[PDB]
């Protein structure tokens, strides 16, 4: 159906998903000289103590690393959030080149790729209901910037071979969602939406200022997965990021 190609890419989305033209859409370009500071913001609380990964998985536009959310095993609180969100899964966004690839941009600056940790608000019963409310979601974005190899990441890319085509799934067990976070957790934040169909406007985005490193050699494996399912004509997942959206009204707060 929809995809990051040419005839079904991010542009023709507003066709089947008219909400792609809402007022709180993501990603966006964060204008560092527009970030307004806010004394109501607290440090990001990343309680990934009992985070329990269950299985990596190729879904058709990226690969997700599903986590158990039966209870508050890995939770996100503090920060700009107002509640407790459970980590449900994380996936990546990369581009055909090393010059581009991240969804969000700092002063129109692009990074090699972007990691997204999706969490839903525990006050909405389940992730499904959760993603229907203006606050039911909290997504943590991490910039992957070219440089040195990422021992943490490699333990991921390392298994991609097990999910080359769509639908495929391997048991990715025991994995610190933390191995992936940067060390200094300053952050920007604003009201947005999912950067992919259904594009629901409910994510309360949190992007991390400092990025994590990735070798030019590594992000190279990302674009080895296939969009299509086994049997169908081989289709490479070379690029899968959405362009910066109109910040329209909104405004980007920051923890600094």
């Amino acid at each position, epitope marked *: 159906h929809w995809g990051y190609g040419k005839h079904n890419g991010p542009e023709h989305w507003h066709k089947d998903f008219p909400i792609a033209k809402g007022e709180r859409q993501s990603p966006v370009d964060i204008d560092t000289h527009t970030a307004k500071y806010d004394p109501s913001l607290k440090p990001l609380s*990343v309680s*990934y*103590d009992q985070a329990t990964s269950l299985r990596i998985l190729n879904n058709g536009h990226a690969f997700n690393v599903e986590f158990d959310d039966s209870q508050d095993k890995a939770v996100l609180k503090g920060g700009p959030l107002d509640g407790t969100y459970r980590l449900i899964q994380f996936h990546f966004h990369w581009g055909s080149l090393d010059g581009q690839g991240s969804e969000h941009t700092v002063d129109k600056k692009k990074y090699a790729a972007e990691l997204h940790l999706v969490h839903w608000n525990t006050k909405y019963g389940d992730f499904g209901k959760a993603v229907q409310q203006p606050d039911g979601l909290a997504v943590l974005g991490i910039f992957l910037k070219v440089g040195s190899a990422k021992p943490g990441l490699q333990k991921v890319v390392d298994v991609l071979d097990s999910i080359k085509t769509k639908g495929k799934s391997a048991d990715f067990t025991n994995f*610190d969602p*933390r191995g992936l*976070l940067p060390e200094s957790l300053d952050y920007w934040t604003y009201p947005g939406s999912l950067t992919t169909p259904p594009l629901l406007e409910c994510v309360t985005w949190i992007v991390l200022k400092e990025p994590i490193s990735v070798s030019s050699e590594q992000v190279l494996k990302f674009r080895k997965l296939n969009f299509n399912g086994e049997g169908e004509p081989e289709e490479l997942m070379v690029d899968n990021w959405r362009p910066a959206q109109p910040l329209k009204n909104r405004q980007i707060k920051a923890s600094f």
Partner: nanobody, 126 residues
């Protein structure tokens, strides 16, 4: 607000040993991952040890003769230093981040942890 007080520093002779302590306020030394790092003069910030409950990690040097622990019953992460070397002479700081992760904690970089203390002078005579 989160106050982080250290104590127990001082001067001791090589081969000696003393125990630094860190008391938290408006913070719970057990929920998140904490640690110590030291700022020796002339040298740059060095990570000593970190802890997140059962998992404790030690800097390649102090490893084996230093020990970190917590007494959450009184919110205090202690740092037991044993058989000190003169090289150890420096200011030791107490840090306490907001990340609950063994992996993130094994990085051993308390000098990047959000909540910091004032440190305590620890001099080792020969």
């Amino acid at each position: 607000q989160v106050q982080l007080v250290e104590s127990g520093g001082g001067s001791v002779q090589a081969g000696g040993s003393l125990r630094l302590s860190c008391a938290a306020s408006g913070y719970t030394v057990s929920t998140y991952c904490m640690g110590w790092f030291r700022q020796a003069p002339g040298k740059e910030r060095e990570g000593v040890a970190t802890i997140l409950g059962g998992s404790t990690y030690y800097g390649d040097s102090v490893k084996g003769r230093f020990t970190i622990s917590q007494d959450n019953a009184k919110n205090t992460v202690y740092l037991q230093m044993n058989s000190l070397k003169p090289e150890d002479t420096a200011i030791y700081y107490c840090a306490g981040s907001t990340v609950a992760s063994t992996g993130w904690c094994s990085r051993l970089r308390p000098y990047d942890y959000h909540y910091r203390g004032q440190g305590t002078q620890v001099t080792v005579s020969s």
